[PDB]
Design a binder for this molecule. Sequence first.
Ligand SMILES: Cc1nc(C)c(-c2cc(C(C)(C)c3ccccc3)n[nH]2)s1
Ligand SMILES: [Cl-]
Ligand code: NA
Length: 215
Amino acid sequence: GDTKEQRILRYVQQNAKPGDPQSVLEAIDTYCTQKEWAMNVGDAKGQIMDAVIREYSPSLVLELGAYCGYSAVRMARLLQPGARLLTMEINPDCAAITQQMLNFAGLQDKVTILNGASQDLIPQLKKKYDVDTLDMVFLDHWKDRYLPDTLLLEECGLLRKGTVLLADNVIVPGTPDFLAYVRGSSSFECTHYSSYLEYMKVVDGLEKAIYQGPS
Ligand SMILES: Cc1nc(C)c(-c2cc(C(C)(C)c3ccccc3)n[nH]2)s1
Ligand SMILES: [Cl-]
Ligand code: NA
């Protein structure tokens, strides 16, 4: 049958313009509002994501949790030429949706999709994907994995001083221990950004944590 994710791709291909990442974002935002999917990203968190990318102008971005490719499109559209986005997706069929989504948008070149679990792929980045350090990390995958994958990104030495970690949904459904760690650690300087979830009528937020070097 035709899945929820395929319906989303299908709508984009009908109503967006190929090679125009912004129209892809509008179309997705428009569909999610029409079908009322509680998809965490909208213009609220989108503006903050855009701002974060603009301020720090990352050469290399790691995303955890590609899903349909909304976040990847939004971020990659602001990347400089020669900059890269690496997005990790554990679900093969989502990975394929994301691919097609990035390809429609004309961003297939900037973005590399890796299928597998974060804790398996992260330790391969330096050797297999010629990564030195990362400039930015967007966490949007399984919430119980935020804290262990942050610690794994430290252990592996993928963070340098000034590397930005940006984590969505830290309040809803919540990543309480992840927060406590980065806010408590001197290795991270932290800022909280608020986003009201108007479908659920409750406050959520993003956490931005800038790695300071090791303790
Ligand atoms: C240990 C993990 N590594 C990665 C890269 C993970 C991941 C999570 C996700 C979403 C789409 C959010 C997901 C996937 C399946 C069920 C629910 C939600 N995609 N990728 S989980
Ligand atoms: Cl998505
Ligand atoms: Na801190």
